[model samples]
Target: NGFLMEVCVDSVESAVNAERGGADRIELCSGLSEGGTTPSMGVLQVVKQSVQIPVFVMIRPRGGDFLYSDREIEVMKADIRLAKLYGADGLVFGALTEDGHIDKELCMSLMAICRPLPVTFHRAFDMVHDPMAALETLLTLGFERVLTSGCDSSALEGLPLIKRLIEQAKGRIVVMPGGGITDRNLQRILEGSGATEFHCSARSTRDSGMKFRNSSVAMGASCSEYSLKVTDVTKVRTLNAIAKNIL
Candidate 1:
């Protein structure tokens, strides 16, 4: 009944809240406002010390495109090494070729450095032109798991393809369905995708009243954006209940 639930968080407080809300693991990163980037070393150390579950560090160095230069790859390698030193359980990363194919050579090199730690081919897999071909490349490289939305914006849209990949994978690796996940849709996703593991933030944010108070604001007034307010325990509980009944 233990499905993988990976919550994304920027700070140690969010990490603790995720654990308490029944997450199996967490992906630690910065710039959650702009997707995500590699977190600082101090944040990594604090999260590792505070959480009992696995903490997988995201290795993207910036908020722009996934394509990286030679120097950027070296920076990613250093980040991976630092995450390992700070007791991170796994690394979540992906890099693609200019033509939207998996960068086999670069992935192999990164996997070599990963050693004892498992690697998760992250959402970049969704950006690949050919997911089936990409899946083959990932298996060849010995990735422990792949986090994907089955080549779509949401798991519901990609569930059929995810089912095919799961059968094709043949227990070679884990297929984790993420993106646009919620309690009401969890069961349908699990049933259609045949995915045993799932990932979501289980997070809720409240709007700050600063926007209303500032009457002189311009058209593009800067208001407080959604913070990682708190982990939603009710959503986690509903997910577990539905998963247990269906799976």
Candidate 2:
């Protein structure tokens, strides 16, 4: 079977690009600069209408860390509820305790409400004190998949652990490798980690279509207002082709 290519998209434009580039699905979020958060219901509603591929909505309320407060968990639960209302095909969520252990009860609670639609435990797996232990917890919790970077900065660097996770999973669950996957290194990681599903942004920079430059006041501390970082269609296509070739 061919490997699945899931793009992490923050906008409808990126979703359209992923579909055009032959990606299998998307993890729709907002604020990619802050590592993604749940997009607005409007964005989710529109994107669902805009694409044929599956849309797994991100349920994170904020971007700083996976550790969320009760208020945040409440917010996350609401977002997960709304995603289905807005027609999301699936959902991604993450939570960890202060000591880096899986918040199994909280996870299971949210999972219960998200029933019918699939749930993907997001990159909070990378922040765990023991990923293999966490994997066991996640496996028994009945999550549909886990999007991880193999407890490293990038999937290529974490290939060894990813391979171990895949081996340990033994097809019982989906262990998808994500974070910093590129066309140049995808083949090596694919052969190395033996992952059957992968995730990425395939992002590229697009200069904002503004003629006037407001360099004095910045929207962010360092981000330029003139440049809009967006997904590159070719990157998705190239990586998809590479992943499929090895099938």
Candidate 3:
């Protein structure tokens, strides 16, 4: 029950699909293909009304880096306020110094606006130059949780550091390992990192029915190019099955 399965999704349709697929929570965002962006207020409202599971809205203004300008920070602050107005369960975000340290002042200010709702430092923590120091800073700032890839490109690659972090965390906060998590590697990442939570898109692309007789007439791509990527029920069930035993 403590295992938090967070699915990153783009639309209300995907939100409902994620919940139906057995996700414990959803992170509503746009441009996930571009590392996630703040979802529109309309999308947040629709997803909130459509699903029973908790939804956390992403607050990134744009995706290139964790560093943000004052205007960008203002935009993120506004987004958080609006998400709360629209009934989001929490806000997932992070900001860092150019040198890769947690922007404590900015994070503190943002956490204030997130009052009553939990604040989760997103994967930007992985970009920090010294992840352990940054992790300590996040805890001191009162963030309820953090999403990380163990300071590596994938959870499997970062398992050792993740294990150290989980032990270091000592129940002060939740260290949710994400990035490249899949059914095959879930157990190893869990057992090695001691993480109680996991995150994945569980996305699978399905072919579209549109057909063309002539290859040239074919919209310059295969029909599979138009295929939709969705959260597969079986994948969720698989992950849940794994979670049931390990977590």
Candidate 4:
């Protein structure tokens, strides 16, 4: 199969740019700065209408951790159905037991309903206690892919383990790496892992056009705002080219 480049974006403009820049798919989320929370219906409508590439909707109800309560699981279950009905191409989500192993039954349940549309066990895999065992569980559950840094912070830092996971997978599932995959360090991961798929935010910040300073009114609190964080169109292109040409 040809190389697949998946760009992570939380906005329409970023999604549009990722498509234009040669991404194979787009992961649509909101609150990217907080590790990405589920986006709204407004974004869902526009993004689905705006791009031709496959869009994987992040089904996370919140951004903190993967251990969700029963009520939250109910919410995510509904979100999965809604995302499919709303025309999402794929679902990106994963939950875990308190022990950090793959929450087999929980994910298996979600994966069951995530039918016609596929499932990608998100970075929650990274937080698992055992990468190899987690990999095996995901495969048994029928997931199409897993986004991970091989139990490390960044893809590059986790390259050795990523390569190992890919070896373990042996084409059973796609071992896509994400998190801090900048253009500069991308090649090492690509070559080392020999993976056809890659995931990245392709991030770059843009300054806001606001012309006034109301520092004390903190929405106005001094730590409140700055430049907008979004996918850099140029970096997306560079990243795709790097992976595409080699594969």
On lDDT, the candidate that comes out on top is 2
Best-performing candidate as measured by TM-score: 2
- lDDT (CA) per prediction: 0.84, 0.89, 0.87, 0.87
- Which pairs clash in the backbone of model 3? none
* Candidate ranking (TM-score, best to worst): 2, 4, 3, 1
Per-residue C-alpha lDDT of model 4 across residues 141-213, encoded as one tens digit per residue: 8889999887898999999999999999999999998888887888898898888898988878787888895
User: Any idea what lDDT model 3 has?
Assistant: 0.87
Task: List model 3 lDDT by residue over 96-192, tens digit each.
Answer: 9999999999998999999999988999988999998998999999998998888888888988888998999997999998888899988898888
- Candidate 2: which stretches are off by over 4 Å? none
Candidate 2's displacement at residue 64, Å, is: 1.8
Better of 2 and 3 by lDDT: 2
| Backbone clash numbers for all candidates listed | 0, 0, 0, 2
lDDT by residue for model 2 (1-247), tens: 3789899898889899988998998989898888888899998888898999999998889888888888998898888888898899998988899999999989989999899998999898999999999999999999979998889999988889999999999988899999899899899888998888889879899888888877788766656778776777898889988987887
lDDT per residue as tens, model 1, 48-166? 88989999999898877678899999999999899899988999889999988989988988888887999999888989998998999899889989988898988888888889899
Q: Answer with 1 or 4, whichever has the higher lDDT.
A: 4
Worst 10 residues of 3 by lDDT: 213-222
Worst 10 residues of 1 by lDDT: 219-228
> What is the TM-score of each predicted model, taking all chains together?
0.90, 0.97, 0.92, 0.95
C-alpha lDDT of residue 230 in model 2: 70
